[PDB]
Amino acid sequence: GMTEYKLVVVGACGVGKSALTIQLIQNHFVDEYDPTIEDSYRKQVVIDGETSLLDILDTAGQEEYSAMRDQYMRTGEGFLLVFAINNTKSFEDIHHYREQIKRVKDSEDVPMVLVGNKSDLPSRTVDTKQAQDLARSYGIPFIETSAKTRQGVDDAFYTLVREIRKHKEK
Ligand SMILES: *CCC(=O)N1CC2(CCN(c3nc(N4CCCC4)nc(-c4c(C)ccc5[nH]ncc45)c3C#N)C2)C1
Ligand SMILES: Nc1nc2c(ncn2[C@@H]2O[C@H](COP(=O)(O)OP(=O)(O)O)[C@@H](O)[C@H]2O)c(=O)[nH]1
Ligand SMILES: [Mg+2]
């Protein structure tokens, strides 16, 4: 059979949400993508032997509270919390993204993966320990990715699917 998964990618402007999503859906690096374009993108893959349809919402546009965005999170089954390793502000924001998702879901048990993107860049500002410790406090996996080289990209998305599978068994 097959399983469908609703994924939502969140994080600050410019962390690589679209680039990561496009690497998953199209298998190459797209370095310029309109920051106002928010959409869902479907991609059929195979994960641990089962056909899996990933509907991936790539959040974008205006950072503004809206009921429409609350509905995205309510519908969403798992969330990539993305920051850039060379952007301390985007890492600081992760807390707020998690808090907002937790608010909507009304739960502390929500499938999430912390993603540190732009791992290819030489000048990092957010240390791995800081991210590892934050993920530990949340009880979620941490995966370093590069949308540029594709390092860790499948691992990030597939790990999130595996976290959703576990949650669904409860
Ligand atoms: C450069 C453009 C870009 O890629 N952006 C990502 C957004 C659009 C969606 N964003 C967003 N931001 C926030 N913030 C709260 C703390 C700092 C920014 N919250 C939400 C959000 C969440 C995570 C959950 C529920 C929400 N309801 N309204 C907003 C909600 C989103 C979203 N989506 C930044 C700019
Ligand atoms: N070096 C590097 N650049 C990246 C990576 N991911 C995204 N970028 C670049 O970062 C900028 C923002 O990427 P984008 O996908 O638009 O981020 P979004 O605003 O979160 O969707 C663009 O100039 C991308 O080319 C990465 O893994 N490595
Ligand atoms: Mg984008």
Author numbering: 0 to 169
Provide the authors' own sentences about this structure as they appear in the paper.
KRAS is a G-protein that functions as a molecular switch regulating cellular proliferation in growth factor signaling pathways. The switch-II pocket is a shallow pocket between the effector protein-engaging switch-II loop of KRAS (residues A59–Y64), the α2-helix (S65–T74), and the α3-helix (N86–K104).
We describe the construction of a cross-docking database comprising 100 examples generated from 10 structurally diverse KRASG12C inhibitors with known X-ray crystal structures (3 of which are newly solved for this data set) and describe a method of incorporating receptor flexibility into CovDock to produce a docking protocol we refer to as FlexCovDock. To further benchmark the performance of FlexCovDock, we collected ten co-crystal structures of structurally diverse ligands demonstrating conformationally diverse switch-II pocket poses. We then docked each ligand into every receptor structure, leading to a set of 100 docking simulations (10 self-docking and 90 cross-docking). The adjacent α2-helix (Ser65–Thr74) likewise demonstrates significant conformational shifts across this set of X-ray structures. This conformational flexibility results in markedly different ligand–receptor interactions in differing X-ray structures.
